[PDB]
GROMACS .gro file of C-alpha atoms in nm:
model
  194
    1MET     CA    1   0.428   1.465  -1.947
    2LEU     CA    2   0.287   1.624  -1.632
    3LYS     CA    3   0.383   1.306  -1.447
    4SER     CA    4   0.688   1.449  -1.269
    5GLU     CA    5   0.529   1.784  -1.184
    6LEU     CA    6   0.205   1.629  -1.060
    7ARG     CA    7   0.407   1.408  -0.825
    8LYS     CA    8   0.596   1.713  -0.704
    9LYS     CA    9   0.310   1.960  -0.652
   10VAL     CA   10   0.113   1.708  -0.446
   11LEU     CA   11   0.420   1.585  -0.257
   12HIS     CA   12   0.500   1.944  -0.156
   13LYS     CA   13   0.174   1.978   0.039
   14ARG     CA   14   0.184   1.610   0.134
   15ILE     CA   15   0.492   1.665   0.351
   16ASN     CA   16   0.352   1.998   0.470
   17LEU     CA   17   0.076   1.827   0.670
   18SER     CA   18   0.125   1.875   1.042
   19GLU     CA   19   0.161   1.582   1.283
   20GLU     CA   20  -0.126   1.732   1.484
   21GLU     CA   21  -0.391   1.654   1.225
   22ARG     CA   22  -0.182   1.387   1.053
   23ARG     CA   23  -0.143   1.165   1.360
   24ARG     CA   24  -0.516   1.186   1.432
   25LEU     CA   25  -0.603   1.088   1.075
   26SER     CA   26  -0.343   0.811   1.087
   27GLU     CA   27  -0.523   0.676   1.394
   28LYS     CA   28  -0.843   0.660   1.190
   29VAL     CA   29  -0.665   0.475   0.909
   30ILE     CA   30  -0.510   0.237   1.163
   31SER     CA   31  -0.843   0.170   1.331
   32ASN     CA   32  -1.018   0.127   0.995
   33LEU     CA   33  -0.753  -0.104   0.852
   34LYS     CA   34  -0.738  -0.307   1.174
   35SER     CA   35  -1.118  -0.332   1.196
   36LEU     CA   36  -1.140  -0.478   0.845
   37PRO     CA   37  -1.256  -0.841   0.896
   38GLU     CA   38  -1.031  -0.950   0.610
   39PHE     CA   39  -0.731  -0.816   0.801
   40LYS     CA   40  -0.836  -1.058   1.072
   41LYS     CA   41  -0.793  -1.346   0.827
   42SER     CA   42  -0.492  -1.217   0.631
   43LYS     CA   43  -0.189  -1.385   0.785
   44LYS     CA   44   0.090  -1.210   0.598
   45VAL     CA   45   0.072  -0.836   0.657
   46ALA     CA   46   0.331  -0.652   0.449
   47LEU     CA   47   0.384  -0.278   0.470
   48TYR     CA   48   0.583  -0.048   0.243
   49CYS     CA   49   0.713   0.243   0.453
   50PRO     CA   50   0.583   0.580   0.582
   51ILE     CA   51   0.859   0.834   0.520
   52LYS     CA   52   0.743   1.155   0.353
   53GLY     CA   53   0.374   1.222   0.402
   54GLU     CA   54   0.206   0.890   0.443
   55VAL     CA   55   0.009   0.740   0.725
   56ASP     CA   56   0.160   0.668   1.066
   57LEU     CA   57   0.129   0.290   1.045
   58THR     CA   58   0.465   0.268   1.219
   59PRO     CA   59   0.311   0.261   1.575
   60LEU     CA   60   0.085  -0.025   1.459
   61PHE     CA   61   0.386  -0.259   1.438
   62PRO     CA   62   0.338  -0.383   1.802
   63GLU     CA   63  -0.025  -0.472   1.723
   64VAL     CA   64   0.072  -0.655   1.405
   65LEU     CA   65   0.361  -0.842   1.570
   66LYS     CA   66   0.118  -0.962   1.836
   67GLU     CA   67  -0.131  -1.121   1.598
   68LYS     CA   68   0.001  -1.160   1.244
   69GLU     CA   69   0.335  -1.156   1.066
   70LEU     CA   70   0.473  -0.809   1.005
   71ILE     CA   71   0.642  -0.820   0.668
   72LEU     CA   72   0.880  -0.546   0.557
   73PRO     CA   73   1.066  -0.497   0.226
   74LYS     CA   74   1.432  -0.595   0.238
   75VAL     CA   75   1.665  -0.488  -0.042
   76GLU     CA   76   1.913  -0.769  -0.102
   77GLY     CA   77   2.027  -0.647  -0.441
   78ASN     CA   78   1.797  -0.427  -0.651
   79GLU     CA   79   1.523  -0.688  -0.622
   80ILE     CA   80   1.332  -0.678  -0.296
   81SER     CA   81   1.249  -0.980  -0.084
   82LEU     CA   82   1.004  -0.979   0.204
   83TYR     CA   83   1.100  -1.084   0.556
   84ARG     CA   84   0.844  -1.167   0.823
   85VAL     CA   85   0.894  -1.066   1.185
   86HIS     CA   86   0.701  -1.173   1.494
   87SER     CA   87   0.918  -0.967   1.724
   88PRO     CA   88   1.085  -0.621   1.723
   89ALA     CA   89   1.420  -0.796   1.699
   90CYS     CA   90   1.586  -0.752   1.360
   91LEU     CA   91   1.514  -0.405   1.228
   92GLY     CA   92   1.820  -0.223   1.098
   93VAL     CA   93   1.880   0.066   0.862
   94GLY     CA   94   2.024  -0.080   0.544
   95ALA     CA   95   1.875   0.130   0.267
   96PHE     CA   96   1.835   0.509   0.234
   97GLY     CA   97   1.733   0.567   0.594
   98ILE     CA   98   1.463   0.301   0.607
   99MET     CA   99   1.482  -0.001   0.836
  100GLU     CA  100   1.483  -0.351   0.688
  101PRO     CA  101   1.500  -0.703   0.837
  102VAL     CA  102   1.839  -0.842   0.736
  103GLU     CA  103   1.812  -1.151   0.955
  104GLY     CA  104   1.502  -1.363   0.983
  105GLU     CA  105   1.265  -1.569   0.774
  106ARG     CA  106   1.272  -1.505   0.400
  107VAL     CA  107   0.920  -1.506   0.258
  108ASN     CA  108   0.828  -1.488  -0.110
  109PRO     CA  109   0.617  -1.177  -0.193
  110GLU     CA  110   0.347  -1.386  -0.361
  111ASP     CA  111   0.281  -1.552  -0.024
  112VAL     CA  112   0.167  -1.218   0.117
  113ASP     CA  113  -0.209  -1.197   0.168
  114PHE     CA  114  -0.238  -0.833   0.266
  115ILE     CA  115  -0.003  -0.551   0.170
  116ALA     CA  116  -0.027  -0.180   0.242
  117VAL     CA  117   0.123   0.039  -0.029
  118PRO     CA  118   0.109   0.420  -0.022
  119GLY     CA  119   0.132   0.650  -0.321
  120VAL     CA  120   0.186   1.020  -0.390
  121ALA     CA  121  -0.157   1.050  -0.548
  122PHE     CA  122  -0.456   0.821  -0.594
  123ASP     CA  123  -0.783   0.832  -0.785
  124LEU     CA  124  -1.128   0.674  -0.746
  125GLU     CA  125  -1.046   0.382  -0.976
  126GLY     CA  126  -0.727   0.266  -0.811
  127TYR     CA  127  -0.446   0.420  -1.010
  128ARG     CA  128  -0.133   0.593  -0.889
  129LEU     CA  129   0.127   0.819  -1.045
  130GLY     CA  130   0.416   0.607  -0.921
  131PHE     CA  131   0.740   0.716  -0.758
  132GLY     CA  132   1.035   0.582  -0.952
  133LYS     CA  133   1.038   0.281  -1.181
  134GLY     CA  134   1.325   0.036  -1.202
  135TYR     CA  135   1.328  -0.234  -0.936
  136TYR     CA  136   1.048  -0.153  -0.691
  137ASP     CA  137   0.786  -0.210  -0.959
  138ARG     CA  138   0.937  -0.557  -0.989
  139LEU     CA  139   0.843  -0.618  -0.626
  140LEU     CA  140   0.493  -0.506  -0.719
  141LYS     CA  141   0.494  -0.772  -0.992
  142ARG     CA  142   0.575  -1.026  -0.722
  143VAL     CA  143   0.299  -0.932  -0.477
  144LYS     CA  144  -0.028  -1.022  -0.646
  145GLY     CA  145  -0.236  -1.047  -0.331
  146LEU     CA  146  -0.453  -0.775  -0.179
  147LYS     CA  147  -0.278  -0.449  -0.258
  148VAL     CA  148  -0.425  -0.186  -0.029
  149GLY     CA  149  -0.352   0.175  -0.110
  150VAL     CA  150  -0.309   0.375   0.207
  151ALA     CA  151  -0.324   0.755   0.184
  152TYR     CA  152  -0.514   1.069   0.281
  153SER     CA  153  -0.814   1.210   0.093
  154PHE     CA  154  -0.605   1.520   0.014
  155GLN     CA  155  -0.383   1.308  -0.210
  156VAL     CA  156  -0.687   1.143  -0.367
  157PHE     CA  157  -0.862   1.274  -0.677
  158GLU     CA  158  -1.134   1.138  -0.906
  159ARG     CA  159  -0.909   1.038  -1.195
  160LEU     CA  160  -0.537   1.056  -1.264
  161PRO     CA  161  -0.355   1.073  -1.600
  162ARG     CA  162  -0.241   0.714  -1.646
  163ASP     CA  163   0.112   0.729  -1.785
  164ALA     CA  164   0.186   0.372  -1.891
  165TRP     CA  165   0.147   0.060  -1.680
  166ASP     CA  166   0.145   0.162  -1.316
  167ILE     CA  167   0.001  -0.117  -1.103
  168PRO     CA  168  -0.358  -0.059  -0.981
  169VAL     CA  169  -0.451  -0.155  -0.625
  170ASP     CA  170  -0.723  -0.391  -0.499
  171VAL     CA  171  -0.845  -0.181  -0.206
  172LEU     CA  172  -0.807   0.187  -0.112
  173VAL     CA  173  -0.820   0.312   0.247
  174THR     CA  174  -0.827   0.679   0.344
  175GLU     CA  175  -0.868   0.870   0.668
  176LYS     CA  176  -1.231   0.949   0.588
  177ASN     CA  177  -1.380   0.679   0.365
  178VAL     CA  178  -1.332   0.320   0.255
  179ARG     CA  179  -1.283   0.258  -0.116
  180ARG     CA  180  -1.325  -0.085  -0.269
  181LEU     CA  181  -1.211  -0.153  -0.624
  182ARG     CA  182  -1.358  -0.501  -0.648
  183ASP     CA  183  -1.725  -0.424  -0.714
  184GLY     CA  184  -1.906  -0.672  -0.935
  185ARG     CA  185  -2.135  -0.588  -1.225
  186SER     CA  186  -2.332  -0.891  -1.342
  187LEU     CA  187  -2.325  -1.271  -1.316
  188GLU     CA  188  -2.423  -1.533  -1.575
  189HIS     CA  189  -2.475  -1.908  -1.541
  190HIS     CA  190  -2.585  -2.028  -1.882
  191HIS     CA  191  -2.694  -1.706  -2.047
  192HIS     CA  192  -2.439  -1.723  -2.327
  193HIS     CA  193  -2.697  -1.814  -2.594
  194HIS     CA  194  -2.947  -2.099  -2.588
   0.00000   0.00000   0.00000
């Protein structure tokens, strides 16, 4: 398929973005995400990790720690558990360069209200192209709350070639616009025949 190449060609420019523009757009995403009234209610705020060409949500940790529970993915053994932190105490590099909370309060991923998950590419329906399947998709099967896709409009298209069963998100936040994938169509009471 074009799955691997499409990931690559977008990722190449994705990591080419300069911190100048990037950091300013990240600020917009931060402000947008933090201004969302549902983020005010969501108690468990889990983030994936900005590493390659995602959004600088890293500096937002202090804000999160102040109000809600900052939840980060901890790899205990292939399967990922989620640990909540209320302080910048336990954050150590355990995995491939990323920091994870090895000591703290073990929370089950299904308890997470709000989670921010980035992707190489997004579309206008809420699909991704994935990264690498194996164990991380299992974590995605755990977290069935509000999955918010966080990325830049550059990595967003109208539609993507859906490979198999990549997990669609609930909300999509960019640096320019707010995308909601929970629009309703019609409502019936007793319209199912008379």
